[PDB]
Structures are given as C-alpha cells and as structure tokens.
Amino acid sequence: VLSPADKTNVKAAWGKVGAHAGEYGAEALERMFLSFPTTKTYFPHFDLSHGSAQVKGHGKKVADALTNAVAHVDDMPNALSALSDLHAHKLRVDPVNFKLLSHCLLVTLAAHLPAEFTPAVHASLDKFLASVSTVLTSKYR
Amino acid sequence: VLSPADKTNVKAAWGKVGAHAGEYGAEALERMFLSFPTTKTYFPHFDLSHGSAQVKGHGKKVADALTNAVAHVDDMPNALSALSDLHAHKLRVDPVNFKLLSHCLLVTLAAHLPAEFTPAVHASLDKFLASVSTVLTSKYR
Amino acid sequence: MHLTPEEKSAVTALWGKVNVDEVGGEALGRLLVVYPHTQRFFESFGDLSTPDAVMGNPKVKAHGKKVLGAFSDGLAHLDNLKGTFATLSELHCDKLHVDPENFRLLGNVLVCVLAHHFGKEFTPPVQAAYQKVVAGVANALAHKYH
Amino acid sequence: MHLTPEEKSAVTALWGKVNVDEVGGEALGRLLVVYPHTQRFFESFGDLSTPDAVMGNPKVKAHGKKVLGAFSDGLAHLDNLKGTFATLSELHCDKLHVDPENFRLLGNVLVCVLAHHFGKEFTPPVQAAYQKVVAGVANALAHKYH
Numbered sequence: 001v002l003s004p005a006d007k008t009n010v011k012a013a014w015g016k017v018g019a020h021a022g023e024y025g026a027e028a029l030e031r032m033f034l035s036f037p038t039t040k041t042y043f044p045h046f047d048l049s050h051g052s053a054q055v056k057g058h059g060k061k062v063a064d065a066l067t068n069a070v071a072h073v074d075d076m077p078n079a080l081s082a083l084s085d086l087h088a089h090k091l092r093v094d095p096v097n098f099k100l101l102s103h104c105l106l107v108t109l110a111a112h113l114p115a116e117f118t119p120a121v122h123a124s125l126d127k128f129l130a131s132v133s134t135v136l137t138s139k140y141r
Numbered sequence: 142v143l144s145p146a147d148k149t150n151v152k153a154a155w156g157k158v159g160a161h162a163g164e165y166g167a168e169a170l171e172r173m174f175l176s177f178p179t180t181k182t183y184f185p186h187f188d189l190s191h192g193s194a195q196v197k198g199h200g201k202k203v204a205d206a207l208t209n210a211v212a213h214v215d216d217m218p219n220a221l222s223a224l225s226d227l228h229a230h231k232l233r234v235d236p237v238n239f240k241l242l243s244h245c246l247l248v249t250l251a252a253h254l255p256a257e258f259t260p261a262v263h264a265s266l267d268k269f270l271a272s273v274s275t276v277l278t279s280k281y282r
Numbered sequence: 283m284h285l286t287p288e289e290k291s292a293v294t295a296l297w298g299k300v301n302v303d304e305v306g307g308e309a310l311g312r313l314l315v316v317y318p319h320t321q322r323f324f325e326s327f328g329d330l331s332t333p334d335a336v337m338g339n340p341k342v343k344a345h346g347k348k349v350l351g352a353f354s355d356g357l358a359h360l361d362n363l364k365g366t367f368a369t370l371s372e373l374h375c376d377k378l379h380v381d382p383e384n385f386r387l388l389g390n391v392l393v394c395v396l397a398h399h400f401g402k403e404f405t406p407p408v409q410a411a412y413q414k415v416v417a418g419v420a421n422a423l424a425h426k427y428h
Numbered sequence: 429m430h431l432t433p434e435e436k437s438a439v440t441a442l443w444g445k446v447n448v449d450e451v452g453g454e455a456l457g458r459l460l461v462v463y464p465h466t467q468r469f470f471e472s473f474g475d476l477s478t479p480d481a482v483m484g485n486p487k488v489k490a491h492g493k494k495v496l497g498a499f500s501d502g503l504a505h506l507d508n509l510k511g512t513f514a515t516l517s518e519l520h521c522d523k524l525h526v527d528p529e530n531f532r533l534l535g536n537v538l539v540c541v542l543a544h545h546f547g548k549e550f551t552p553p554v555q556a557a558y559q560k561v562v563a564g565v566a567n568a569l570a571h572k573y574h
C-alpha cells in the first residue's frame with residue numbers, strides 16, 4: 001500500500017517527467033525488448049527495430065496511462081478498470097512480464113532524472129509500479 | 142478475487158482434509174525442502190531430517206492457520222493480520238517462497254484426495270493459496 | 283540439469299507406468315482451467331468456457347497427447363535436452379510466439395497431475411526429481427529464444 | 429557465460445570508470461531501503477529505520493564496497509563465474525543462510541545505480557549486457573546451495 005510520502009514522491013518525480021513521458025515510455029520498452037527478449041513474444045505484429053513508430057506510439061500510450069494513474073493515485077482500481085479488463089480478457093500477458101517492464105521504467109527514470117532519483121523516491125516508484133501491475137492483473141481469473 | 146464457487150470449492154476440499162491437516166502441513170514442508178532447497182535458508186535452526194518433530198509441529202501450525210483462513214474466507218485480511226505482521230516485520234521471507242510452498246500444498250492435496258481434486262477444485266485451491274500469500278506479504282513495505 | 287543416477291532411475295521408473303495419451307490431455311486441460319490466460323494461444327480450439335468444455339474438448343486432448351509425446355521423448359535423452367528440443371524451441375519462439383513462462387506453468391501442473399494419479403507413490407524425493415526434470419525441459423524449450 | 433565480444437567489451441569498458449567504493453555503498457544502501465525485508469541479515473549494523481540512516485551507515489558503506497569488490501573480481505573471470513564464486517556460494521548457503529533471490533534483487537538495484545551514475549552512456553545495449561552479467565553472477569552465487 002502506498003503511503004502519503006509515497007504518493008508525494010511519485011507525484012513529484014513524474015512531474016519532472018513532464019513532456020518526456022512519451023520518449024521515456026519508448027525508451028523503457030526498448031530497454032525491455034533488448035534485455036528481456038521473451039517479452040517480444042507479445043508484440044509479433046510490431047516492427048521492433050530501433051526507432052520504430054509502433055514502439056514510439058506504444059510508448060506514448062503506456063506513459064499516458066501511468067500519468068493517469070499518478071493523478072488518480074488514491075483511486076487506481078477505478079481509473080484503470082478498462083486497461084485492467086483489456087489485459088485480462090484480450091492481451092493476457094503473463095504476470096511476470098510486468099516486473100520486467102517496471103524495472104526498465106525505473107532504469108529509464110534513473111538515467112534521465114539523476115538529482116531526483118534519490119533512494120526514498122526509487123523506493124516509492126518501485127512500489128507504485130508494483131501497484132499498477134497488481135491492478136492490471138487483478139481480473140485474470 | 143474468490144468467487145462464490147471458489148469459496149464453496151475450498152470449504153469442501155478443506156473439510157475432506159479434516160483431522161489430517163497437520164500431517165499434510167508437514168508433508169508439504171518436507172516436499173518444499175527437498176524440491177526447493179533454497180527454502181531451507183529460513184530454518185537454519187530446525188532439524189530437517191525425515192520425521193523431524195520440529196517439522197511436524199510447524200506443519201501443524203501452518204495447517205491451523207490455513208484452517209483459520211477457510212473459516213474466515215470472507216474476512217481473510219483481518220483473520221490473518223497477526224500472521225502478516227510477523228512475516229513482514231520479523232521473518233521477512235522473500236515473497237517468491239510463498240509460491241513454492243503453495244505449490245507443495247497442492248501437490249500434497251492431490252496426492253491424498255484423488256476424488257475431490259478435480260480441475261475446478263484445483264483452480265479454486267490455487268486461487269485461495271495465492272490470496273493467502275498476498276495477505277501475508279501485504280505489509281512488507 | 284544435474285540429475286543423480288538415483289533421481290534418473292526414479293524418474294524413468296515412474297514414467298513407465300504413465301498413459302501419456304490420458305496424462306497429456308489432463309495436463310494441458312488443467313493448465314487452461316487453472317491459468318485461463320494461457321487460453322490466448324488456443325482460440326481455434328472452440329469452446330473453452332467451462333471446466334467441462336475444456337477437459338472434454340477433443341482438440342485439447344489431441345494437443346495434450348502431442349505435447350506429452352514430445353515430452354516423453356525428452357525423457358529418453360536426459361543428458362541432451364537442449365539438442366533434443368532445439369527445433370521445437372525455435373518453432374515456439376519464431377512461429378507460435380509463446381512466452382516461455384508458459385512452459386514452467388505447464389511443468390508445475392504436470393507435477394500435480396502426476397501426484398493426483400499416483401498418490402503415495404509420488405514421494406517427496408520422487409517429486410524433487412520431477413521438479414528438476416520439468417525445469418530442465420522448460421529451459422531447453424526456451425534456449426533458442428531471441 | 430553467453431556473452432558476445434561486443435557485449436563483453438561494453439561491460440569491461442564501462443566498469444573501468446566505476447568508483448567501486450561509491451557504487452557498492454549506494455547499491456547495498458538502496459537495496460535495504462527499497463526492499464526492506466533484506467534488512468534481516470544486517471540487524472547488527474545499526475540504525476536502518478530511515479533511508480538517511482541507511483545511506484549514512486558506515487558499516488553498510490563498507491559492506492557495499494566489499495560486495496562490489498568481489499563482483500568486480502568476477503568480471504575478469506567471465507568465462508568461469510561458477511568456479512570463481514564457488515566458495516562464496518558455499519559460505520552464503522552454509523554459514524550466512526542468504527536466500528539466493530536476494531542476489532537477483534541486488535543485481536537489479538545495481539543496474540539502476542549504474543544508470544543513475546552514467547546517464548546517457550548507460551544505453552539500452554549496454555544495459556542488456558549488464559543484465560546478462562548480473563543474472564550470471566546470481567546464478568554462480570546460487571550454484572552450491574543444497
């Protein structure tokens with residue numbers, strides 16, 4: 001469960017993300033496909049080469065759903081119902097993959113947001129990413 | 142989330158377990174120890190030879206806590222509160238280990254309950270153990 | 283895949299008594315009922331909406347038989363799992379696009395199916411041998427992923 | 429270790445620029461704050477109630493350097509991690525009773541720290557190579573558990 005400090009920590013870091021959210025989203029996906037090649041099995045329709053437009057576009061989508069979650073942080077399950085249904089009944093991504101994306105999102109934030117990526121903030125973001133994941137997988141069965 | 146059918150399934154299977162719980166608790170532990178040796182790092186103070194009394198005793202405690210959760214199936218986070226603080230603040234067992242024990246409990250029940258361990262029941266029992274594990278791990282950070 | 287001769291003997295000895303046709307149908311079907319997300323790969327198989335629709339589906343049974351057949355064959359080559367499964371690995375990755383975590387879930391369901399059929403005979407040491415075997419098969423099926 | 433020559437040389441060249449004292453301190457530090465349950469092995473170290481306390485704790489800083497020192501030695505034996513880390517494995521199992529899962533956690537924290545320090549240079553390809561090394565090292569460290 002996210003404590004008050006956590007929410008505050010998450011809102012502030014993602015605030016500095018500002019308009020790079022899309023770019024960071026694409027970068028995280030790119031790190032994930034390279035570091036954890038099993039994840040490519042969910043995207044066989046994508047051109048996965050460096051700088052592809054599908055990855056870019058998909059990275060904006062992911063980043064924007066996270067922005068929505070930060071803004072609806074005390075109310076995640078409702079803000080994400082729709083994506084939650086999408087992942088459980090159509091995409092059906094195995095839950096282990098969510099940890100791989102989260103780690104990559106973290107590596108991405110750390111590389112671009114040095115001053116802001118303090119130990120307590122790293123802590124907070126990692127719990128935040130875990131709740132989002134919990135939420136996206138809660139209707140699987 | 143447990144469904145009405147899941148709850149009915151778990152009560153039924155657990156009732157057939159009855160006064161064998163303790164013994165199955167122990168067998169599950171011995172299975173876990175042999176199949177996933179890394180789990181022994183948490184019991185450096187126990188004698189883990191076949192038939193050990195410490196293992197028997199602890200098997201009983203695990204099974205009794207599971208019996209408690211089945212009796213409070215609609216209020217598990219509250220019924221298991223004390224166990225959850227213990228695991229989070231003192232024991233600090235890494236969460237992957239719960240999956241391993243839950244698997245060994247399923248194998249133990251399959252091995253002893255051939256007529257009730259149907260596919261539907263296996264599904265419900267698996268969901269129940271995941272929920273118990275989730276409760277016990279909810280306060281880690 | 284460090285199996286001791288004593289582990290390999292227990293594995294081979296129990297496997298001799300398995301009806302693979304039937305065990306294969308039960309394992310593939312139970313995977314689809316306990317872990318419904320795995321149904322993403324089988325939409326051409328028809329109705330998978332209830333436990334009975336899954337367990338009795340003739341396409342699930344036929345596919346289970348084929349899955350476990352390749353598996354039994356691997357038990358005849360326990361010192362060369364990688365080679366034995368090289369072509370199936372590639373196929374699963376490049377053509378069928380199956381996330382390898384699926385091979386681990388199937389292995390743990392097989393273990394419960396085996397426990398269900400053999401009861402007491404599936405002893406903790408016997409289970410331990412089969413856990414190393416299913417981990418080995420899963421890793422071999424994943425080794426050609428890229 | 430399945431490492432490419434271009435992967436091996438990406439790892440090596442980046443490491444040549446690491447201040448091991450700082451990075452060790454920061455990794456071990458970050459591990460205890462982000463994953464509080466890892467604190468079970470360090471009760472005797474002192475106050476770890478807050479991130480500031482953890483990061484400031486000199487025994488933590490010193491232990492970090494010792495851990496990353498050994499990791500640093502392993503990077504020069506990339507063709508034989510198992511043999512390099514064999515004794516360390518035994519001791520982590522037999523005397524220290526550390527769950528090998530913790531090794532994977534440190535590995536990933538370690539990777540975030542390298543990105544934090546090197547920014548642009550810690551590019552997707554370079555990260556992919558460090559994930560491979562870090563998984564390799566955890567596996568070697570876990571190998572003698574029984």
Ligand code: HEM
Nearest residue numbers: 039042043061062065066083091093097098101102132133
């Ligand atoms: C942080 C966790 C994640 C979030 C917030 C997230 C969010 C989203 C969003 C917004 C979409 C777009 C839905 C639409 O177009 O309406 C999507 C689709 C999709 N996601 Fe998830 N996602 C997450 C993790 C993952 C994971 C881990 C995978 C698998 C590795 C995955 C696989 C997919 C796929 C394959 C699509 C459809 C792609 C397409 O056809 O364009 N997602 N996700």
Ligand code: HEM
Nearest residue numbers: 180183184202203206207224232234238239242243273274
């Ligand atoms: C089904 C999930 C589990 C349940 C229901 C459970 C329940 C319990 C209970 C009732 C106790 C007794 C503590 C007391 O005397 O008040 C306990 C202690 C303990 N548990 Fe858990 N446990 C679970 C999983 C795990 C696993 C996965 C681990 C790690 C492998 C673990 C490690 C321990 C340890 C080391 C103790 C202390 C034993 C001692 O020194 O006496 N438990 N647990």
Ligand code: HEM
Nearest residue numbers: 320323324348349350352353370378380384385388419423
């Ligand atoms: C023990 C691990 C497995 C083995 C040894 C195995 C073996 C096989 C074999 C021999 C084939 C037929 C290849 C062909 O048509 O040329 C096959 C096909 C297939 N396998 Fe795997 N399999 C395994 C696990 C899985 C799992 C876990 C999944 C997904 C949950 C899966 C999904 C599929 C699919 C979708 C096909 C093609 C089905 C079709 O023809 O419509 N397999 N497998």
Ligand code: HEM
Nearest residue numbers: 466469470494495498499516524526530531534535565569
């Ligand atoms: C990157 C993987 C790791 C490496 C290479 C490593 C290496 C080392 C080394 C070289 C020692 C000193 C041994 C001696 O003095 O004989 C040590 C001690 C120790 N390590 Fe690890 N370590 C790793 C990860 C971990 C983690 C994740 C934990 C637990 C979170 C841990 C717990 C310990 C403990 C408890 C000691 C003894 C400390 C003391 O003297 O009080 N290690 N480790």
